[PDB]
Design a binder for this molecule. Structure first.
Ligand SMILES: C[C@@H](CCC(=O)NCCS(=O)(=O)O)[C@H]1CC[C@H]2[C@H]3C(C[C@H](O)[C@]12C)[C@@]1(C)CC[C@H](O)C[C@@H]1C[C@H]3O
Ligand SMILES: C[C@@H](CCC(=O)NCCS(=O)(=O)O)[C@H]1CC[C@H]2[C@H]3C(C[C@H](O)[C@]12C)[C@@]1(C)CC[C@H](O)C[C@@H]1C[C@H]3O
Ligand SMILES: *[C@@H]1O[C@H](CO)[C@@H](O)[C@H](O)[C@H]1NC(C)=O
Length: 532
């Protein structure tokens, strides 16, 4: 089957077709379809005007303007609002009424390309593997990151959340123009890790995506995360301003100015440290979503009515915050150096700032219940990893799923926990599933690039890819185009049952009550403490 030229709302598009099997199994590949007209700096997206005759969709366009390794904004260009579609094809004839799985990349909201990092055409987010096995259409798309993506003054002079709008624009395009590619319009599945996970959440919660999303999958990130919303945006708008020589004495004046400023300078004005800083790095992420009067109307925790009829899944990697706490504290040297009570306290202090010393010493105690002297440092270093994992991903997620469940009209909820430890020979032996370790497995990387992967890896990859895809089709992580090695039971507030995910996927896999106690300390105790 060869879809050849497809008829979008903008005109005919034409992409390759790749020979897979001999019994006619193929894969139509479309790279670079524009979903929106090149955006006006610090302005909402506008539909694409359309083209002349036929668009040669054969290559990944350029990512949105972003900083390289903060030394130069040497990446991407203001023009980047495109999407890449993967349609698996059948010998007898072209695919029809298939499920659709859109993917939202993540990079602290300040980084990212729809193609995903690569090495000699080995694109981290190549939706071929996931599409083939699943027999589902993979859609990856670009969106504005960095200041240009979410710069805000707090009020109508420059609301922010442009990046999200872009995301919403893609979805809207995939809703309208997917049937022509053979997809099922009324079966759109949003899925993404980190900022993407937070984005997945935000999109479902946003009243703008009313009837566009059918399924949703957040991973290592949810809207309720601390890093997922900017509480004081105007504090940072003023900063960029002073750097780009704009008037900081009035929002209207600022805005008018910023929109006129050279995007490269607007981008390179902000630089995340990544070095000895007084405060834990969470405090430096500045440009991320915010609450506005329309997209994200209220606090995400209050918007969950909207995702009521949106099947949902959310999970976390057991040691998700390891990455981060690494830079915050060089714990990882489970060799020479050793962390102390003071080093742990300081950490807790910096991570509790909102509630002050009251919340600080309280939290310290609750995380210091168990013990292990300097001789048994391992428990300490692990605890820090646990501290970060809790506030950064676990707890927010835990309240997200729980929250969804309570509000679900008719929508299955599920939660997981990627336990498959990292290969990273650098980290201490006690290392579990770090942040982003889930990615490769979800993308069939173990099958696309076998050498450098072993059975287990192909097993986890196959499992996850088995689940996501079944989910995308029916909503049940067990039902669809593939068989599941272990049954994924729908989440219940009572049991707080989660599917642990790793090599051994049998029956004991679905566990219950993952740190319900800390869910309690944060949701009930620490929360009651006064804001300082
Ligand atoms: C061919 C390898 C590259 C390193 C090389 O072989 N050097 C060894 C001898 S020497 O050093 O050259 O002296 C391969 C084997 C497995 C590979 C990796 C890899 C980059 C690359 O192709 C690697 C690391 C990557 C993370 C690259 C990004 C990608 O999207 C994921 C991918 C996973 C995996 O396939
Ligand atoms: C990470 C937890 C604690 C906050 C965190 O430690 N922030 C660290 C930065 S700081 O140094 O304190 O500033 C989070 C995770 C998800 C959170 C909760 C939460 C309080 C809180 O921030 C929690 C429990 C709250 C009921 C707080 C009020 C809010 O509008 C609803 C919200 C639900 C959810 O976000
Ligand atoms: C501060 O933390 C210590 C433990 O490090 C605790 O004993 C104390 O009660 C806490 N509060 C104050 C005000 O010191």
């Amino acid at each position: 089957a060869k879809l050849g030229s497809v008829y979008t709302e903008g005109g005919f598009v034409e992409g390759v077709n790749k020979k897979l099997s001999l019994f006619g199994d193929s894969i139509d590949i479309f790279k670079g379809i524009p979903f929106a007209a090149a955006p006006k700096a610090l302005e909402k997206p506008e539909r694409h005007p359309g083209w002349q005759g036929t668009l040669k969709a054969k290559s990944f366009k350029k990512r949105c303007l972003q900083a390289t390794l903060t030394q130069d904004s040497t990446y991407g260009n203001e023009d980047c609002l495109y999407l890449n579609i993967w349609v698996p094809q059948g010998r007898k004839e072209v695919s029809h009424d298939l499920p659709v799985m859109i993917w939202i990349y993540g990079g602290a909201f300040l980084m990212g390309a729809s193609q995903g990092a690569n090495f000699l055409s080995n694109y981290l987010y190549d939706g071929e593997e996931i599409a083939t096995r699943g027999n589902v259409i993979v859609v990856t798309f670009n969106y504005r990151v960095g200041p240009l993506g979410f710069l805000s003054t707090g009020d109508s002079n420059l609301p922010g959340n442009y990046g999200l709008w872009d995301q919403h624009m893609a979805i809207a395009w995939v809703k309208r123009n997917i049937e022509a590619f053979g997809g099922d319009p009324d079966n759109i599945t949003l899925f993404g890790e980190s900022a993407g996970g937070a984005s997945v959440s935000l999109q479902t919660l946003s009243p703008y995506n009313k009837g566009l999303i059918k399924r949703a999958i957040s991973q290592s990130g949810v809207g309720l995360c601390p890093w997922a919303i900017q509480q004081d945006p105007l504090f940072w708008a003023k900063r960029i301003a002073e750097k780009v020589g704009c008037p900081v004495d009035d929002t209207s004046k600022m805005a008018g100015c910023l929109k006129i400023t050279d995007p490269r300078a607007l981008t390179l004005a902000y630089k995340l440290p990544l070095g000895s800083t007084e405060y834990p790095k969470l405090h430096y992420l500045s440009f991320v979503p915010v609450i506005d009067g329309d997209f994200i109307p209220d606090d995400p925790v209050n918007l969950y009515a909207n995702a009521a009829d949106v099947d949902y899944i959310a999970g976390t990697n057991d040691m998700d915050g390891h990455l981060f706490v690494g830079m915050d504290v060089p714990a990882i040297n489970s060799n020479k150096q050793d962390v102390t009570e003071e080093d742990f306290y300081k950490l807790v202090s910096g991570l509790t700032v909102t509630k002050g010393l009251r919340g600080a010493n309280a939290t310290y105690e609750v995380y210091t219940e168990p013990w292990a002297q300097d001789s048994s440092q391992e428990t300490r270093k692990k605890t820090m990893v646990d501290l970060e994992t809790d506030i950064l991903f676990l707890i927010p997620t835990k309240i997200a799923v729980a929250q969804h469940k309570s509000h679900a009209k008719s929508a299955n909820t599920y939660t997981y926990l990627f336990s498959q430890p990292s290969r990273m020979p650098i980290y201490p032996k006690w290392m579990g599933a770090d942040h982003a370790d889930d990615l490769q497995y979800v993308f069939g990387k173990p099958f696309a690039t076998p050498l450098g992967y072993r059975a287990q890896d192909r097993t986890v990859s196959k499992a996850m890819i088995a689940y996501w895809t079944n989910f995308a089709r029916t909503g049940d992580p067990n039902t669809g185009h593939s068989t599941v090695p272990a049954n994924w039971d729908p989440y219940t507030l009572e049991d707080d049952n989660y599917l642990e995910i790793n090599k051994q996927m049998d029956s004991n896999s679905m566990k219950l009550h993952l740190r319900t106690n800390y869910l309690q300390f944060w949701t009930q105790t620490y929360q009651a403490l006064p804001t300082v």
